[PDB]
Amino acid sequence: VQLVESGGGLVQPGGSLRLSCAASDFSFYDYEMSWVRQAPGKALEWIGSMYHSGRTYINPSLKSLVTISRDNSKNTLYLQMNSLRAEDTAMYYCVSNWASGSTGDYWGQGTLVTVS
Amino acid sequence: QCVNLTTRTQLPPAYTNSFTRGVYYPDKVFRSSVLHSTQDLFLPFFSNVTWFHAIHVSGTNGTKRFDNPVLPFNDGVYFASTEKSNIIRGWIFGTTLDSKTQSLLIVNNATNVVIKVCEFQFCNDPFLGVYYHKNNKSWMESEFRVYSSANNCTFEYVSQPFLMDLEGKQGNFKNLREFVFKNIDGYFKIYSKHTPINLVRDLPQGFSALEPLVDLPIGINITRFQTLLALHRSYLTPSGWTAGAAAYYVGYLQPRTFLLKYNENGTITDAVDCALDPLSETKCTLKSFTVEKGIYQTSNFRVQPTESIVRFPNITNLCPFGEVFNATRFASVYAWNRKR
Amino acid sequence: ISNCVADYSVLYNSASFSTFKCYGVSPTKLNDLCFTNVYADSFVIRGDEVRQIAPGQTGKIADYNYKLPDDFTGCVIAWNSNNLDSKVGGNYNYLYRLFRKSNLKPFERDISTEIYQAGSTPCNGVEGFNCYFPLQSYGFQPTNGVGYQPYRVVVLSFELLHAPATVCGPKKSTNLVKNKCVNFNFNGLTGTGVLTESNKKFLPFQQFGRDIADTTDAVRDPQTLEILDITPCSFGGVSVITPGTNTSNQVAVLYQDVNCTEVNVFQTRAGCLIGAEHVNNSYECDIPIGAGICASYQQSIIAYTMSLG
Amino acid sequence: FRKSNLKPFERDISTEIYQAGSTPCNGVEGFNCYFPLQSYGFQPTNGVG
Ligand SMILES: *[C@@H]1O[C@H](CO)[C@@H](O[C@@H]2O[C@H](CO)[C@@H](O[C@@H]3O[C@H](CO)[C@@H](O)[C@H](O)[C@H]3NC(C)=O)[C@H](O)[C@H]2NC(C)=O)[C@H](O)[C@H]1NC(C)=O
Ligand SMILES: *[C@@H]1O[C@H](CO)[C@@H](O[C@@H]2O[C@H](CO)[C@@H](O)[C@H](O)[C@H]2NC(C)=O)[C@H](O)[C@H]1NC(C)=O
Ligand SMILES: *[C@@H]1O[C@H](CO)[C@@H](O)[C@H](O)[C@H]1NC(C)=O
Ligand SMILES: *[C@@H]1O[C@H](CO)[C@@H](O)[C@H](O)[C@H]1NC(C)=O
Ligand SMILES: *[C@@H]1O[C@H](CO)[C@@H](O)[C@H](O)[C@H]1NC(C)=O
Ligand SMILES: *[C@@H]1O[C@H](CO)[C@@H](O)[C@H](O)[C@H]1NC(C)=O
Structure with a gap:
């Protein structure tokens, strides 16, 4: 498959989870990677944006909370979330080229973020 | 898919005789029992039909060879093909036979026809990608091996497929599909018709009034084209490509003058040229198919020139426009520094 | 967008937009104005920059997103999306750019995110x-x-390349009447005549037909596929039968080959002659009319049949 | 804009609002x-210009 995602299930607040987003080749990595959320009723909120030029620009109140790591063997992205909240409880997607609309992107299988 | 096994067949075209072929309705106008003279592109009668015999099963044991060279498209071409099956997948009209330039494609895809002109990425061998998925036992119908990729599609056409098999009688028809593809004023017109044939290989002497099907306002000029051929992956049997054999004909169109006989239903019944022999050219002047005895004045004969000759003076003194156009100072308005 | 029918008319009245800025293209005539291609461009622009969508006003967006060219062929359209994109708390989704190597030229997808000083x-x-x-x-x-409210903007740009036109919407149609002189316009065929039902036998690829001397006789309407005959309705010259001004003043007028049912009245082979009574007698007449019928003044104008002898 | 075209040598003073x-x-x-x-x-x- 050209673009896929991995990792997820149940996320423990405070801890670190090594999420993944695999693919088939680096030539399909134009121009962006992003791990976003689409909450019911909430407007567009993007939690991550990995760029083709090796840049990660995030909301200033989020980039400190997010670790960034990019791979090229499996072309996977490593991102860690801590102190989780219920506002992220959605079908958590790994959307490559999120800003490129809903035709030049892949929507992953999805997971959930729940706080006990 | 991508089978280059010919190695022997680039034979000169075995020219044969086309008796009465290439007659078409060059309009969408009804006429009843009248004779009309038109100046369009037609196939001359009794002309050398350029026969590019298709895949040759020289019979000792198989030995099938691809016989589809890329052929030029000056102004218009006439096509004939027996095609007991749908051996020819379509056509490869284009200009550069490479990327960076659009190319018109017709794909058989024998459920519906998809006429596409797009940007393409010419492969090693352009043929409809037809392989098993290894599941569902379904042959592929992708253009991803017709061209390595497809992008920037400006036109797509969906309709009933062009090639209809109306035989239903185990042969004795042979369905000589006749095609002429004409590009005038940035358009593209598709003409075809299905007829029965009892002859073995030679074209029949009967009249085939062929009706137009669709017109394409692509706007893309074509100066070169190639034809497709059938391809299927082999099996685990005690490789196997191009099941069967075919025979494909090519004829080029030239600007000639015809007079078309119209029946009382508007269908063309006969057609006579105006440049083959004096008798046919005489019928054009009188606008009738029957001429009584006597003497007629038709046209005049002119001895065409053979070459050209130019005689100019031998001086090569290199006129001094450098000192005039690039003069150091252009003179005043009332003192014209005229330089003979 | 290519080879499609554009419903510009419904756009003006379907809802209300923010602005409709056209230069060189009248708004109401977009229904019959023709270009070659149509570009649908998707925009998200700040409310303060809504008026700044014009050649001459720049900013953090207009100087680095996509410079507005001087060859606009189309018009801008925007609408209020406050109920869909405006909420207490703000939105921080769509991207900015501060500075780059150079300003992005018109129509250049420089989507890359390189590092610049x-x-x-x-x-x-x-x-x-x-x-x-x-x-x-x-x-x-x-x-x-x-000026700090979100908006959704869609702007149309067209083309006039060296190719046949493909994108225009003919929302024009009229009913069909018969047996009357009508200035019909059947898919470009313009003329005058009476529409009558025909008994001809067309083929399903022929728009119309002409019998002899390039004169149209049958026209096929491209909506219900019927063959309609064409005939120019009655015409002809008018001639006046007079015995001379000095002799008298009563005159009779002729209508050449025109049935008076479509216009004393007497029916002749050369049209209905009006103004003269037809007598059953037959005299050696002086003024000829046609087909053996004549006229003479002897105290009113009366028509006869020629008496050879 | 205008309702229709202008006849040769015509004067326009009225400025009423039109559709x-x-x-x-x-x-x-x-x-x-x-x-x-x-x-x-x-x-x-x-x-x-
Ligand atoms: C679909 O859109 C365009 C046509 O509709 C195609 O663009 C053409 O192909 C090239 C890719 O943009 C362009 O060449 C690039 O532009 C300049 C000219 O040499 C160079 O700076 C670039 O290096 C060059 N790109 C490369 C790899 O060399 C053509 O100029 C351009 N031609 C026109 C008329 O637009 C696109 O190719 C096509 N989209 C895709 C993905 O192929
Ligand atoms: C086409 O022309 C021929 C005669 O020139 C006609 O074909 C047949 O003519 C008879 C005359 O009544 C009809 O009864 C038949 O129905 C016609 N054959 C068929 C298959 O219909 C006919 O007048 C013309 N039109 C057609 C065939 O559609
Ligand atoms: C066809 O080609 C051959 C030689 O190539 C020539 O001799 C022959 O006259 C041609 N036939 C016609 C009808 O022109
Ligand atoms: C040009 O013509 C010939 C060249 O063969 C020669 O006499 C000489 O170069 C020229 N003659 C003239 C200019 O008369
Ligand atoms: C005139 O001058 C310019 C620059 O010096 C040069 O490029 C050009 O060729 C000259 N024009 C002619 C007719 O010599
Ligand atoms: C054209 O449209 C009308 C109604 O929309 C329909 O009755 C008629 O059959 C249509 N004719 C064709 C040729 O589609």
Whole structure:
């Protein structure tokens, strides 16, 4: 498959989870990677944006909370979330080229973020 | 898919005789029992039909060879093909036979026809990608091996497929599909018709009034084209490509003058040229198919020139426009520094 | 967009937009005005920059997103999306750019996110002194002014290339009447005549037909596929039968080959002659009319049949 | 804009508001009924044309 995602299930607040987003080749990595959320009723909120030029620009109140790591063997992205909240409880997607609309992107299988 | 096994067949075209072929309705106008003279592109009668015999099963044991060279498209071409099956997948009209330039494609895809002109990425061998998925036992119908990729599609056409098999009688028809593809004023017109044939290989002497099907306002000029051929992956049997054999004909169109006989239903019944022999050219002047005895004045004969000759003076003194156009100072308005 | 029918008329009255700025293209005549291609361009622009969607006004967006060209062929359209995109808390989704190597030329998808300097010191792969983030985000608040409200903008641009036109919408149609002189317009065929039902036998690829001397006789309407005959309705010259002004003043007028049912009245082979009574007698007449019928004044104009002898 | 074309050597003084869009204004200012008169901007360093 050209673009896929991995990792997820149940996320423990405070801890670190090594999420993944695999693919088939680096030539399909134009121009962006992003791990976003689409909450019911909430407007567009993007939690991550990995760029083709090796840049990660995030909301200033989020980039400190997010670790960034990019791979090229499996072309996977490593991102860690801590102190989780219920506002992220959605079908958590790994959307490559999120800003490129809903035709030049892949929507992953999805997971959930729940706080006990 | 991508089978280059010919190695022997680039034979000169075995020219044969086309008796009465290439007659078409060059309009969408009804006429009843009248004779009309038109100046369009037609196939001359009794002309050398350029026969590019298709895949040759020289019979000792198989030995099938691809016989589809890329052929030029000056102004218009006439096509004939027996095609007991749908051996020819379509056509490869284009200009550069490479990327960076659009190319018109017709794909058989024998459920519906998809006429596409797009940007393409010419492969090693352009043929409809037809392989098993290894599941569902379904042959592929992708253009991803017709061209390595497809992008920037400006036109797509969906309709009933062009090639209809109306035989239903185990042969004795042979369905000589006749095609002429004409590009005038940035358009593209598709003409075809299905007829029965009892002859073995030679074209029949009967009249085939062929009706137009669709017109394409692509706007893309074509100066070169190639034809497709059938391809299927082999099996685990005690490789196997191009099941069967075919025979494909090519004829080029030239600007000639015809007079078309119209029946009382508007269908063309006969057609006579105006440049083959004096008798046919005489019928054009009188606008009738029957001429009584006597003497007629038709046209005049002119001895065409053979070459050209130019005689100019031998001086090569290199006129001094450098000192005039690039003069150091252009003179005043009332003192014209005229330089003979 | 190519080879499609554009419903511009419904756009003007379906809803209300923010602005409709056209230069060289009248708004109401877009229904019959023709181009070659149509581009649908998707825009998200701040409310304060809504008036700044014009050649001459720039900013953080108009100087680095896509410079507006001087060859606009089309018009701009925007609408209020406050109920869909404006909320208390703000939105920080769509990207900014601060400075780059140069301003992005019109129609150049320079989507890349390379590192650029605002000053002159090198970045060395680390953003900092004179090397800042070339990406930021929107901010919109309903508690703010009108200029800080989100909008959805869609702008149309066209083409006039050297190719046949493909995108126009003919929302024009009229009913069909028969046996009357009508200035019909059947898919470009313009003329005058009476429409009558025909008994001809067409083929399903022939728009119309002409019998002899390039004169149209049958026309096929491209809506219900019927063959309609064409005939120019009655005409002809008018001639006056007079015995001379000095002799008298009563005159009779002729209508050449025109049935008076479509216009004393006497029916002749050369049209209905009106103004003269037809007598059953037969005299040696003086003024000829046609087909053996004549006229003479002897105290009114009376028509006869020629008496040879 | 105008309702129709102008006859040769014709005068226009009336400046009544007329429909310029798709909704009926009946004399109401704003959308779909444009104010006709507009003012140019002549700058010393403006374009050549
Ligand atoms: C679909 O859109 C365009 C046509 O509709 C195609 O663009 C053409 O192909 C090239 C890719 O943009 C362009 O060449 C690029 O532009 C300049 C000219 O040499 C160079 O700076 C670039 O290096 C060059 N790109 C490469 C790899 O060399 C053509 O100029 C351009 N031609 C026109 C008329 O637009 C696109 O190719 C096509 N989209 C895709 C993905 O192929
Ligand atoms: C086409 O022309 C021929 C005669 O020139 C006609 O074909 C047949 O003519 C008879 C005359 O009544 C009809 O009864 C038949 O129905 C026609 N054959 C068929 C298959 O219909 C006919 O007048 C013309 N039109 C057609 C065939 O559609
Ligand atoms: C066809 O080609 C051959 C030689 O190539 C020539 O001799 C022959 O006259 C041609 N036939 C016609 C009808 O022109
Ligand atoms: C040009 O013509 C010939 C060259 O063969 C020669 O006499 C000489 O170069 C020229 N003659 C003239 C200019 O008379
Ligand atoms: C005139 O001068 C320019 C630059 O010096 C040069 O490029 C050009 O070729 C000259 N024109 C002619 C007719 O010699
Ligand atoms: C054209 O449209 C009308 C109704 O929309 C329909 O009755 C008629 O059959 C249509 N004719 C064709 C040729 O589609």
